[PDB]
Amino acid sequence: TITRNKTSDGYTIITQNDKQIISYQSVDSSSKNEDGFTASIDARFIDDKYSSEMTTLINLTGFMSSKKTAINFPVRYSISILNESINENVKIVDSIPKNTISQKTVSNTMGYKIGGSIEIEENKPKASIESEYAESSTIEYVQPDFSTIQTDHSTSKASWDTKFTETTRGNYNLKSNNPVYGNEMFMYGRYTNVPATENIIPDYQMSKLITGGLNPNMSVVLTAPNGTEESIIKVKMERERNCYYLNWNGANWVGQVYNVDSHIFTFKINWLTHKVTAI
Amino acid sequence: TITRNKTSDGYTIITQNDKQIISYQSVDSSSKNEDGFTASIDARFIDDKYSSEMTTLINLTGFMSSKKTAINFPVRYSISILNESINENVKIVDSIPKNTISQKTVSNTMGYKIGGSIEIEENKPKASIESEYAESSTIEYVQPDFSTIQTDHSTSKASWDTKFTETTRGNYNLKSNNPVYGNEMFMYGRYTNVPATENIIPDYQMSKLITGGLNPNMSVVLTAPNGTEESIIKVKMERERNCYYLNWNGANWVGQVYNVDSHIFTFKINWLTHKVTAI
Amino acid sequence: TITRNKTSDGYTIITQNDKQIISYQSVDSSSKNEDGFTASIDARFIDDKYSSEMTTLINLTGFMSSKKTAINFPVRYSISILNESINENVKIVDSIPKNTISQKTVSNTMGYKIGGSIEIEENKPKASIESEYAESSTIEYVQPDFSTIQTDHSTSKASWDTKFTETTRGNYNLKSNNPVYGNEMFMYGRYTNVPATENIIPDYQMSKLITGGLNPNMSVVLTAPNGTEESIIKVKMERERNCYYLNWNGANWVGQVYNVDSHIFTFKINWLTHKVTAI
Amino acid sequence: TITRNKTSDGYTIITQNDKQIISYQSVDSSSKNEDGFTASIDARFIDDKYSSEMTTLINLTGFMSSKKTAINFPVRYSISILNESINENVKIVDSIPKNTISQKTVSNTMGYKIGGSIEIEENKPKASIESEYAESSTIEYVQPDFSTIQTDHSTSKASWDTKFTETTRGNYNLKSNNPVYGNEMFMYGRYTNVPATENIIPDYQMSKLITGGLNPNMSVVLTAPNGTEESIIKVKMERERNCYYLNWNGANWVGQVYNVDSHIFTFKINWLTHKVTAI
Amino acid sequence: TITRNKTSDGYTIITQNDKQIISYQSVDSSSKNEDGFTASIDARFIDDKYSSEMTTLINLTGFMSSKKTAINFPVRYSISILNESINENVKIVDSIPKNTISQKTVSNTMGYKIGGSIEIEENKPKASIESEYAESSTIEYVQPDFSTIQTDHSTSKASWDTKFTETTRGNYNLKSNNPVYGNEMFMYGRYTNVPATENIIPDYQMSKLITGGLNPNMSVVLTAPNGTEESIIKVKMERERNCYYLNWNGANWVGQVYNVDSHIFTFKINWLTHKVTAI
Amino acid sequence: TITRNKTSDGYTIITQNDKQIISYQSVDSSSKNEDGFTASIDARFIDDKYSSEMTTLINLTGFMSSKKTAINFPVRYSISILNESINENVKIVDSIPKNTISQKTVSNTMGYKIGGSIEIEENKPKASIESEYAESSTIEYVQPDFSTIQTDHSTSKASWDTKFTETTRGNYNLKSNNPVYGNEMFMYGRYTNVPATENIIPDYQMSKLITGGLNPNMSVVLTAPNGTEESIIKVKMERERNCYYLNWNGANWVGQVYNVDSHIFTFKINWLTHKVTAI
Amino acid sequence: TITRNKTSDGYTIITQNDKQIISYQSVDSSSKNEDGFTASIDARFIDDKYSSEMTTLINLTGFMSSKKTAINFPVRYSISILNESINENVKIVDSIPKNTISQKTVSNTMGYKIGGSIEIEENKPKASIESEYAESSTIEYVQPDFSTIQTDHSTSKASWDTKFTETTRGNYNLKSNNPVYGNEMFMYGRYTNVPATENIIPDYQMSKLITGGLNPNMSVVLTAPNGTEESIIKVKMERERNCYYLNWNGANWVGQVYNVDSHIFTFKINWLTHKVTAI
């Protein structure tokens, strides 16, 4: 699979190799500083001699910053990729993150005990017999701090999102309700008797994704028939947040839990020149 | 992919190989001894025949020393990388350290017990029946001594930082408060009755990052269109510290916890000559 | 990347390979027998066709012997590497040993129990109900016998040191104080009633680094602009020791814990001839 | 890196390869049957085109047999390698066995329990409340049966040794002392009432190194400037032993614990001819 | 490192490769059916262009069968290899099986408990306080069923042997002595009341090496100066056995424990012709 | 190590490679359906340029079916390979399955407890002190369901066999004897009160080797001097079985345990033609 | 091992490689929809230059569907492969699935406890001494849900089968019998008081092989002398099923457990043309 050529001047020889798979890579980035939204697209174009149609791989990356008495704290992120050239026969054949099935560990035990006691006192007998029976079981599983679920996949739209799950210490969630303390999420001490600002929980116990932004990684595969030259890609990003509130109720420290930011980014693809640009 | 040439004098043959990916590497360092701040930049330039634009990888390393009655002890470090040639279309497409999601291990068990005892004394019966029911659960997780969170990523600025977390022995933190002993961080004995200097805790129990400086490792990827010749990189470093205080309260040994150093370094990049220098 | 040549006499052919990275290695050693100090420097010179400046790797090794009623026993070692050609633009860009962050394992459990007992005697009832509640937690970590902390890194000086930590049996340290036995480090039996020399602890329980010397391993990277021919390297070594004392207090065996050796070694480097020598 | 030659007679072609690293190996052995001492030296000579000086690797192996009422039993071995050509600039740059730092596993737990019991008798109440608090910790480590410590390293002399540590069953050592049984090392039964010879402990429980000899493995690296032709190596071997004694004290079986063999071997090295011989 | 030659007839080309290390292998076996002794020697001859002397590797294998009221049962095996050409400068430089050092696992724990109970009866107080303290330790190790110890190594003789250790069930050994049952090795039931032959223990619980023979694997390295042509190797094999006896003592089943086979094999080696034969 | 040749017609070139080790493989099978005995021999012939004598590897495989109130059930299998050409200097140098040494895990623990209780009643003291001491040990090992022991190895005969060991549930064996239930091997229920045929144990609990036949794997190495042309191999197979019997004894279900099949197969080997056939 | 040829027209060169082992593969399938029986045969033909006879590998695969108050549920599957060309010297030398030997884990422990209590009341002593002794053991093993046993292997016939074993929850089997509940296999609740159809057990708890069909994997090796052209292979498949029945007995829910499908498939093999077809 080599092509060679000789020359008269100096007997120069120029050999070249004929390869099967050739890829090209281009990257593009864009940002909206007012919302703390940044997105990058990495595109790879694959030239294969045995394939019937053109293939482009569209990786996505970026940063969604998380913003931070009462404290505002995010609760949900959402990312969507839209194919806007459907009438040109450009199609979304695959998306990398997928849904999986969890595993649980189960154990069961059953036991029997029997005991006989003879007690000889001074010329006095006390015979006692005892019997016991027991059964138990154990369940084990593993719990992430955030959960990512693919929600849609079609010829034009792939949509993913993530949501708040639970705290590592105390196992509280957004729906808990203690009769006299309300919601004890992000509460240090019930009776510390210090200013509200000082009663909040140390930051390190909070998840990294609440203090700092999420870092997406998503990939989509596109194909097209021979000759296609242009394509538009739209990326939609949404963020939802809520607020936690803490106050006095007599001597008790009690709390309670009660907008949406979004932006659309556009990119243009050139298949013939192997180029990706912002638009 | 080889180019060969012959010569008349001695039939000398000079073969050369044509490769796809060629990299170049240059390093530069600088320091500010008065603050104990040192920074190094390692730059790699990548020449790829199939890529549409130039790529430079900018690794960063350095040393931030930690300085050390009352004892001063650091509490937070912060590093920021700034791209200052935005109007020339030089862009930050990627940053290596990222945010991750932790895992927790959860177990639950439930059990039942039943017991029957027959006690025959001298012509005296004593029948007793007992019943028990129990439930329990266990949570497991892993805790670092320091925590690093990425806080910003954009076209121009990437900012990281680290903060104090907790002690390995005693699990104290910066917000603890015992009613009669105050804060027991870095306290050997409550009643040792020795001079204040002697009551401090042995150094080895303290984290390495408090006794000795942090060693950063950060990487940033830059790209540019064809022909770009120059670029300015700014690196900002900040350190925050606080003080611990211990005194007598009658017979009790009690304690309490109550500036910011910074510097900006500048580097110049030459794309055409593959050079990095201080400035 | 091959250069070939033919000859008339016997048609002798001499082929040579053109390689990218070429390294050279030289080693040098020196000692001071009076103090039991020995040091060795291994230098590697790297010739790279794609690098902008010369690089030399300076590994360091050696032996610091530990010297050994009252017994003298070391407590701290310290090593420092000094670059003495700063005005010639020879710079220390990297040092291999670094500071790291430890990990802790944390577990928490909470449980509930309930029990009902019915006791039918001869026409006599005795109903009893019991209830229990419990909580606990466990912390795990790992402890070395000696600890090495990097204390300084700059353009000219890199300084490391090591210190005594604790005993494997008994978990004593240099600051412990029992009211009636004093310090029980290196004490076999409180009441053995044998001569002082015989009451010391068997040697094997002591750490290897106290009975025998430390074996350093340190590496430093140096770079220089084209044409540099000479460089001076200074290596400083210090050792600190203390004494343990044991005596009678009536029938009780009690103890207590109450100079500094140093030397500077010099080496000369020749970049052009790829040579390292003592000086 | 190939040299080729053609010939007229039969067109014979003789190709040779030019390699970078060439090693040579020679071995020599010697023994002293009266003391059960045997020693072997394996020497490797390295020819490197990029090294500034000659290097020889001197591995050492051998057998030191252990000799075996009262029973004689070894307690310490010692090996030393001496370089006797210091005035010719032949130097010991490295020795393979080194000192290492051990690891300990530490755990701590704290727990709380609370219990309330209500006991209704025939019109009689008996309310009881109980409370418990507990704390504990665990230490784990690993213990060899023999211990090897490097004791000296210098330009001329490297010295190692090994010593007896403890028994696998009973954890006795050379300094133990029971008031009425003395030392119970190597004692089967306190009251077996059989002849002294029969009361000794079965051999298999004893360590292999006491029943049979130690098998040393030691390596030393030597270097020299160009042109060196000869070198003398001295190997010193010492063995220390003691005796265990057992007798009657009324009905009790009691015991107690109360020379040095050595030899020097000589070897001659020839650098130019790559030869090692006894001398 | 290739030698090539051309020919006129048909332009036949015969290329040969010049290799550095060439080995030759020959095997020989012999047996003595009357004693169930079989031995095999595998010899490998190594031709190395960079070595100063000839080397031969002498592996050994074979079968020693174990022979089997009163039952005869082996207790010790012994193998020895003798070099009988010492005056020709043929020497034993190495032997493969060696002595090793075992490892033990040690743990220690200490705990404290405290408990307070308040008991309010009908106008009657019963205050009780309890306190507990505990300490414990654990030792772990691993035990083979047979043990192999190298006992001698010299210029002429290498001698190994193996001995009986203990039973897997019951942990008995050759020196145990129960006052009323004697030795309970190989005894099924104390009171089974069946004929002596029937009271023996099932065979599977016995070690494989007692029911069936040992399979030795031993290796010895020999070297010689240039020109050596012949060598004699002697292999000595010994086996020791004892007897177990069982009888009635009233109603109790009691037992007690109270020649040597050997043979010498001879082999002849031819260095020049690379041959091994029986003799 | 290549031989090449050119030709005039079409310039045809025929290259051949000269290799060191060449093997040949032939297989043969035979059966005796009346006894359910099948045997296969796989023979490999090795041609080595550096070996002094010819080598043949004789693998063996086959099937021995197991045959199946009173139930017949096998108890022992035995396989023997016989070399019948001893007078032609054809010898058995090696046999693959061998005897091995097992491992046991041993642990020991010792602990001390002490407790002091103070009980203040209404003006009544009850001081109690308690003390405890405990010791324990644990033994672990692994148990196969069948056991294979090599029993003989010589110049002419290699003999192996396998025997019944124990049940996975209940740990019974062939020598157990309960006073009132006899042998409880293969008994479902003592009082099920169903026909004898129905009281047998479900088949799955029985070992696979009793329900279905054993699958042997044995290998033997033969060597011979140059020129040998023929060899006879005899394979002997034996199987032993016994019977289990169950009956009523009043209301109790009791049991008790109270020929030999064999065949010889013959094979012929041709060394010169590399052939194996039945005979 | 290459054959090359040149040509005049365009100097075309056609090189071919001579390989040692060449394989051919053909597959064939067939089904009987009325019984849900499907079978596939994959045949591989091996041409080896060093083998004395032809070899064909016959893999087998397929699907046997399982069919599903009273519920019919399978209980046994059986597969048999028949060689029908015995008189042509076509022979079955090997079959891949085989019988194996299981492993059990056994542990034993023995312990001793001793306790002394002193109780000083108001001028009243109560000395109590207690003693305890205990022994225990543990057995571990692993249990599949279905079991496959090879039952026959001969020159013409290889027969395998599988059978029902036990339930994962409750450990019931086909022979269990509770006096008042009968067989509790596939029974949800004893007193649920819902229609019979509703009391059956949820499907997921049942084994996959009962709800869905078995997927066989079997392989057989055939050999033949040179020149063989045709061969017939017969595959026999059988399935056995039974029924479970449940009804009322007063207030109790009780149950009890009380045809055979088969088919023969035929395939034809062509050795010379390397073809497999249905017949």
Residue numbers in the entry:
A (entry chain E), B (entry chain F), C (entry chain G), D (entry chain H), E (entry chain A), F (entry chain B), ...: 8 to 286
Can you quote the paper on this entry?
Recently, we determined the molecular basis for the specificity of CPB toward endothelial and leukocytic cells by showing that PECAM‐1/CD31, an endothelial and leukocytic adhesion molecule, serves as its cellular receptor (Bruggisser et al, 2020; Tarek et al, 2021).
In the present study, we describe the cryo‐electron microscopy (EM) structure of CPB in SMA discs, which likely represents the membrane‐inserted pore form, at near atomic resolution. This allowed us to unambiguously build a model for the CPB octameric pore except for two loops in the rim domain (Glu76–Ser89, Ala283–Pro287), 4N‐terminal amino acids and several amino acids with unresolved side chains. It goes through the 25‐Å long N‐terminal ß‐barrel, the central large 72,900 Å3 vestibule, formed by the cap domains, and the transmembrane β‐barrel. The narrowest points have a ~ 6 Å mean radius and are located within the NBP at the level of the positively charged Arg11 and Lys13. The wide cap vestibule features a balanced amount of positive and negative charges, while the transmembrane β‐barrel is overall negatively charged, especially due to Glu152 and Glu162. In conclusion, the CPB pore has a C8 symmetry unlike the C7 symmetries of the homo‐component members of the hemolysin family and similar to the enterococcal EPX toxins.
